Symmetry: D2
Subunit: 265 residues, 4 copies
């Protein structure tokens, strides 16, 4: 198995000084990814972020992390739907930064229909990115964690992995996120001698990812969220740092719902 | 909008499948979940279509046993659930041969034999393609038929591996795929809320032959973890399949039923 | 040491309750889960004991319908599940009158009508005492009998309120009690692993008369939240009670079955 | 009308409890969840009220340590959570002494030592009274205060016993009580949606001294069932208490966090 933190103080437990964190899908301006990276940078991590289509957005984010926190930071192209791209990512980050201590598997894409209206290829694309893309990052980084004897993998899942969203149909997305949640549990057991694995399941977060949804659908959502509002990505940074850091050295195979209370109903 | 309650008051009338057609994928083995679901449905009066992949002879013998024992019409079809074209063809053939499909039991599946670090990417892909995308292919192929008819019941064989992580054998690709299958039933129950019910059954360790690739000493460790202290038998699951497939469950949709001898209570 | 699989192969033999005795608490109303469970079990050939608290007459009417319709031995007993002495007396009287108890359906229950801040401490205690401790009283009372006989099946009526928080009415005491009932079934399934099975059924909104104190605008809002779009009917639940009480489920223990028209899928 | 997101952008500012007051029940022991939660909150700048039942001297030493180590105001109170009057008096006294309560950590609890057949009804009532109703008593007492102020965070120490049945020791009363606490957090998260967050933490086996009565050879069977292969330490949980108590979790409500070395993954 794995050992308890040697730190007594919580600020020592939360510190990421001397550690390297990778955040996939942190190229946008206010997503879960850039906020997780900001939290880790604030705790002193060196941070590697990835992009797929938004190179300029990721380069801007890296310059912001450098300006605000003075950390070692860098952006990488990664298509998580390709295992070869995830393998190269881990190879390049280990080369450039020396090691990877925590890996935040955060990249994902949305669905826009149920299974009968959607084509088989539309199902394949969402499963390839959201489910197999997360498996590709886990396998690629897990080989590194096994050689080092330590590591933390944090998977961004979704409350859609627990419930079926309404009124928009998106079963392919719901199913892939469900697989991600159980992947965290199953890898926590597989990797029990060398690494922790946990998942965070956000509710409706105002990141821009849902901008393709009509306005009037989004006001229905609000009546279903007990808190009555969308979340903000900066309300999730504490959870990412919690799982990536030594504040959670007995936490493995857990899922943390962050959803304004949506799943309580 | 929505679905209606059974008209039947008697439970025996509710459970009857006389006049109805049931498809069971992966029912070619002699003592698997598939043939026992098919037996239970045929006993209630269903016409039954079963599928095989590699066990063509076992499927023909099962069909003959179903017909002679229960007096029903049955037929076996070759189907590779990992191919949508094969699943679409199955639904078309059964609807042509039998006239309709009232219940579909998505039961075909294959096992994993390693965790993700020891396994290749292709070994992962194979298990997900069969167990997760194969269930999706069958769900989509038959759901177009259910939507046209305005009724239907889809029953998915998941696994307790979709809830917990097996020990000591590593099989994460199988665990993840089955977990996807469980939530697929919940999400499709909501998607199809106007015309069909969808539910899953999550068996524990069932003595079907599927686990024969695992040493017997590892199977002795499983028994100490099962509160009932034994493997199940496929004949102990037939009532759940018939429950979901019939009118005994017209308000049950999006449910999962663990049949694991208590394994998940610890 | 653990429990054994059913001897029967055919589903109708597994489902039969000929020669067995079923107790259903709280089956005094004309269309509740309780009387429909008793009808399902009686249809399968069981002798049936039902209980009442305030509705002695309705329980008597039900015994007479059960006997006329199904030709079985039936009898009504007064029982206050909130009193352990009364549950102990129930099991003692039924065993004296019927010879034994094979299946026990712990179904009696009462609602709450506020959250914890608007409610008094007495209001909390009353709901917990009836719904949680009353289920415990029956389980303990009959469990001593199951342990002596080496066999048995306990079926607990929980609620989807044990999984989610109902909206817009506040009823946290009832939610909490029902969540305890659900986990009581998992925990007793493990505790009683050598001699009896325990499972729960979690109904959604069922048109039994129990929510007749709820206004109409509120009930129409519920329907928009139910994917099936309608209240359930108690006759749609009899199949689940019989499944768990009979030998159709000899590998099923520690399971919960949501019967909620899809409500908890969202 | 709902609750709002933190105004802070920096995580350190979000975690800060400067100017806030935290109550931690049952923090009188030397290495329990309570004193580590209290140390975590003191480290972030909170004023801290801790309670004791039997260990008055242990609580006073803890208060002297908190004030010496962290330079904060701290105070010990006697509280019997099984008595509503005591919990109501606790909130009144802390509000009078400190001015307000911003976060309340409902952590006091007691263990069970048998299953329901070996245990008496008294033994069941005692555990439920302390572990379920004691938590309700604190929730009700502080929630009246949270409602008045329009802000607050309630953190409930539940247990993985609220999710699974421990083996080999039988403790169904405790398991059931902890399952009530877990759902109580979800249900109050919704009831209190306009003014306060409610969340639970479910520890696995933590080396606090609470399990010192368990035979040592039973404890090493536990370790074989924990993927991490060891007991936890209370200092590994202080991060989670501070997370829920502070502004680092202003969109997190109705959540449960398992901290169990992976025990429930199997
Ligand atoms: N927003 C919500 O309400 C919500 C709720 C629950 C869960 N989530 C999940 O949170 C995670 C982050 O999403 P977000 O809301 O923060 O919006 P976002 O800022 O747009 O993040 C999406 C990230 O995923 C990357 N991405 C998409 N496809 C990729 C692929 N094939 N390969 C590699 N990277 C890919 C994107 O990169 P590029 O932009 O460079 O192409 C982008 O950086 C996702 O997994 C999402 O499913 C979001
Ligand atoms: N046995 C257990 O302990 C257990 C526990 C939990 C869940 N399950 C699941 O229960 C279901 C039935 O398995 P079983 O235990 O009853 O053993 P089984 O008799 O061998 O059934 C598996 C069926 O799946 C078919 N199959 C495999 N791959 C297929 C593919 N690509 N396309 C179409 N069909 C394919 C097989 O057909 P052919 O033989 O003709 O090739 C076979 O009939 C499976 O989904 C399994 O994951 C089993
Ligand atoms: N209807 C729903 O929507 C719904 C949903 C989920 C769960 N449930 C649960 O289903 C179960 C049956 O309720 P129902 O809907 O079928 O309505 P019901 O017909 O009124 O059944 C309630 C039964 O419980 C008995 N009862 C109440 N308090 C009792 C006590 N202290 N001791 C002994 N018996 C007591 C009642 O006896 P008397 O009438 O003779 O006094 C009555 O027969 C209950 O546990 C309920 O919580 C109902
Ligand atoms: N240790 C574990 O493995 C574990 C696992 C899961 C959950 N938990 C839960 O964690 C919480 C704290 O326990 P712990 O492990 O940290 O051991 P602990 O140090 O002995 O804490 C138990 C605390 O609860 C107080 N207490 C007991 N009965 C009380 C009552 N009727 N009223 C008020 N206070 C009462 C005790 O006060 P006095 O000592 O002053 O009498 C004590 O301070 C408990 O709820 C426990 O159920 C523990
Ligand atoms: Na829900
Ligand atoms: Na478990």
């Amino acid at each position: 198995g794995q050992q308890a933190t040697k730190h007594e103080s919580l600020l020592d437990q939360l510190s990421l000084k001397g550690k390297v964190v990778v955040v996939t899908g942190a190229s946008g301006p206010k997503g879960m990814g850039i906020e997780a990276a900001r939290g880790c940078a604030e705790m002193g991590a060196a941070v590697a972020i990835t992009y797929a289509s938004r190179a300029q957005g990721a380069e801007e984010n890296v310059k912001e992390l450098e300006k605000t926190y003075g950390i070692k930071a860098k952006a990488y192209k990664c298509q998580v739907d390709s295992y070869e791209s995830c393998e190269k990512l881990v190879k390049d980050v280990v080369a450039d930064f020396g090691q990877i201590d925590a890996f935040i598997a955060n990249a994902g894409a949305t669905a826009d229909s149920g299974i009968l209206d959607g084509s088989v290829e539309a199902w394949n694309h969402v499963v390839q990115v959201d489910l197999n893309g997360t498996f590709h990052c886990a396998k690629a980084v897990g080989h590194h964690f096994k050689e080092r004897g330590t590591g933390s993998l944090v998977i961004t899942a979704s409350m859609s992995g627990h419930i079926a969203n309404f009124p928009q149909e998106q079963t392919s997305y719901n199913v892939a996120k469900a697989g991600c949640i159980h992947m965290a549990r199953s890898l926590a057991n597989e990797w029990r001698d060398f690494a922790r694995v946990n998942s965070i399941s956000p509710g409706y977060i105002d990141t821009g990812l849902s901008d393709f949804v009509p306005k009037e659908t989004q006001q229905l959502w609000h009546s279903m969220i007990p808190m009555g509002r969308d979340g903000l990505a900066k309300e999730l940074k504490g959870a990412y740092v919690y799982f990536a850091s030594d504040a959670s050295t007995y936490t493995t195979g857990a899922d943390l719902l962050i959803d304004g209370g949506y799943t309580t109903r």
